[PDB]
Design a protein around this ligand. Sequence first.
Ligand SMILES: Cc1c(C(=O)C2=C(O)CCCC2=O)ccc2c1c(=O)n(C1CCCC1)c(=O)n2C
Ligand SMILES: Cc1c(C(=O)C2=C(O)CCCC2=O)ccc2c1c(=O)n(C1CCCC1)c(=O)n2C
Ligand SMILES: [Co+2]
Ligand SMILES: [Co+2]
Lengths: 381, 381
Amino acid sequence: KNPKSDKFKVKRFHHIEFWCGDATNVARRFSWGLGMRFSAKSDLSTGNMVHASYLLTSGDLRFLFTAPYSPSLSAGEIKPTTTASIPSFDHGSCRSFFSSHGLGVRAVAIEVEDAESAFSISVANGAIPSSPPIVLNEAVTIAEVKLYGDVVLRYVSYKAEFLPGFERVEDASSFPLDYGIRRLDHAVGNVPELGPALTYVAGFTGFHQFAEFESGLNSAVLASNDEMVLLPINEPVHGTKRKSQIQTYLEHNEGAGLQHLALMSEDIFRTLREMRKRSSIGGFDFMPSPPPTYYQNLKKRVGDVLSDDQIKECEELGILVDRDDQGTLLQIFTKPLGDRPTIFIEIIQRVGCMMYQSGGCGGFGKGNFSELFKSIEEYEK
Amino acid sequence: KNPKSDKFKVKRFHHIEFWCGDATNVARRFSWGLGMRFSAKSDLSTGNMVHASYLLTSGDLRFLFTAPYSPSLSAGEIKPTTTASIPSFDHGSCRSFFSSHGLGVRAVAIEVEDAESAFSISVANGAIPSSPPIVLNEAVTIAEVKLYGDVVLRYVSYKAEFLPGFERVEDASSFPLDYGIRRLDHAVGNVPELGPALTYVAGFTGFHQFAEFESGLNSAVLASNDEMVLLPINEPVHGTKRKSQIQTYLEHNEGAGLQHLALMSEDIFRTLREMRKRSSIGGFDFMPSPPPTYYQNLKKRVGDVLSDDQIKECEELGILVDRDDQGTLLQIFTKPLGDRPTIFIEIIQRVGCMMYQSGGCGGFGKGNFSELFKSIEEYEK
Ligand SMILES: Cc1c(C(=O)C2=C(O)CCCC2=O)ccc2c1c(=O)n(C1CCCC1)c(=O)n2C
Ligand SMILES: Cc1c(C(=O)C2=C(O)CCCC2=O)ccc2c1c(=O)n(C1CCCC1)c(=O)n2C
Ligand SMILES: [Co+2]
Ligand SMILES: [Co+2]
């Protein structure tokens, strides 16, 4: 059931912005580890005396890495005279974010028809304003409201390449890496209390609950009208035997924030081959693979979707598989992206639900919690 | 002339410690870019609730990357009960350093015979104390005094693998990268006033001035008894036509600090081939190469040390060449290592002065300032 209750017209995920202490080193690590090309910049070389911002792209996926310069470089500026390319940026906010949370996502940006209207309707329906709408070079409008913790939901609308004041990256500096990643599938927040978090966000967006089909969490998924913007939210379940990874997150992050980004691949096998080749030479590590009993149970569950060879290739790469009513999900999780046990990445591919592929095809893999546990216990046997 | 006036027994450079906001991403970038292996760690997985510290090694070169965790993880600890592996670490100091200076060197560590004695003699002769001597697991002693800006000189002495509380890195996580870098040759500070900086450091170390043989700087080099610990210092020269790069550093760094680290290679040609292959895929960029007139002038200057083929290979890789009374220097400089135009790396190889090779063989390349300018002007012609 999809009531299509969006309070304003939402298109797709636009970008994800990380707040960093040094954007250069994070961006270069991410570029090599995920196979994303350097595509635009806004920094001292482009006249930005306020913040260094580097944009990485893979297909439609846009990752932005931003860090502050010394405030002394821009001490004479005022907001009307700023050289910042992101007018919502604030030195104090950024340093406070990073010192509190460490490396993580500051903004989940979605493209909308009219960012000024989206902001107004949002705050009229309970959204806490973060940065008012600002028109950039009469071409692009940006606005921000609070989403959860210190994460903002950023609205971007275009009248008619990233943002004004960003420059395309020199082709010699721009190596065309590509491991198959194509777009952001979903972005997930961890909160202490799920109910109030959902009521707030669904309240100002009109996003609806996306239907699902002991592991330390309860969760729900908010979705836009065509279910292409997907925002799951987790809360911890306390008092278990094994401590909730949601609770660990909240402790090490100093509260609510973004837990994982799920990146859709056009060929998860190639993506995982390429990423795993680089794990020990500057790229990303992956969670420990399931025991072979997990793959020795996959035939009974998805043998009508994947061949035995394609199942064996899942075993080689540690890929997980889940299935809902309409489709199948291949997924795998990285280890945390930085020093703290907080944000990580999920790589996914969805099979089925053709009409274009409909959003959320195959679900989000919550069945893989019990299947992983089951396979682990029976592998011990 | 070498008076051998060291006030205590100094051995060699031991390590360089960077203070970071996220040690993981910086360390992984540096590992891939410079061909350094992950060799030890101290972090949550080793029981350190205070700071994440990752050690990279190439030959004798040791780079340490440290970042703070949330103070909340260790709020119940006191110094007698700390889980930090580096007892001089302080959350507030580290966050203040990084917010002020961005990514950079906090500690230049040298190995000494007796770190307690080195500290005492140093402060008795004018050194400003930073962290008092602390004995670690009855095995290693660490002490720190101020060097310049917020950079400390760290003394380390061993009674008899990095430091207690650090664990060797898992062989699967430890890929044996190596591009030929073997040791730290020198570490250079930028200061507003050279005279007082030299008087201070030479005052408490007994280091002597190392003899040399319009570019925006004056400099001098302090050296230990066998001239294997080398600490150059630069000051800006104001009122020029082209603004001093030393002054730019001081502005963007918010004052004095470490300008460059010079890393000796056993084969600078292989090192530069390997590093340049990775510049656009997560590694380090290099300064723009000299015009071919520079190499079309090299035969007249070093044709008795390098063959025409080895000179052509310098041209391919952008290597600079200089010569003093006793030896020859091959050198090249990276672009800044992070967001700000502050710290960079120099790769060097020294030819000559065999007795072992004596320290500083070939000098530091200050002649390459005029040779670069000359070649540039005559290339225009
Ligand atoms: C995060 C996640 C998802 C997921 O993506 C998801 C949403 O997208 C939306 C709803 C909630 C929800 O869980 C699915 C399966 C998972 C994990 C996951 O984190 N772990 C962690 C153990 C320690 C680190 C990995 C697992 O073992 N399994 C099997
Ligand atoms: C830093 C350096 C050295 C050097 O290492 C040195 C000391 O070790 C000790 C004494 C002072 C001293 O200069 C030698 C030659 C150099 C440079 C250098 O920074 N540049 C910069 C232009 C813009 C970025 C590169 C150059 O062009 N040349 C030729
Ligand atoms: Co997910
Ligand atoms: Co040098």
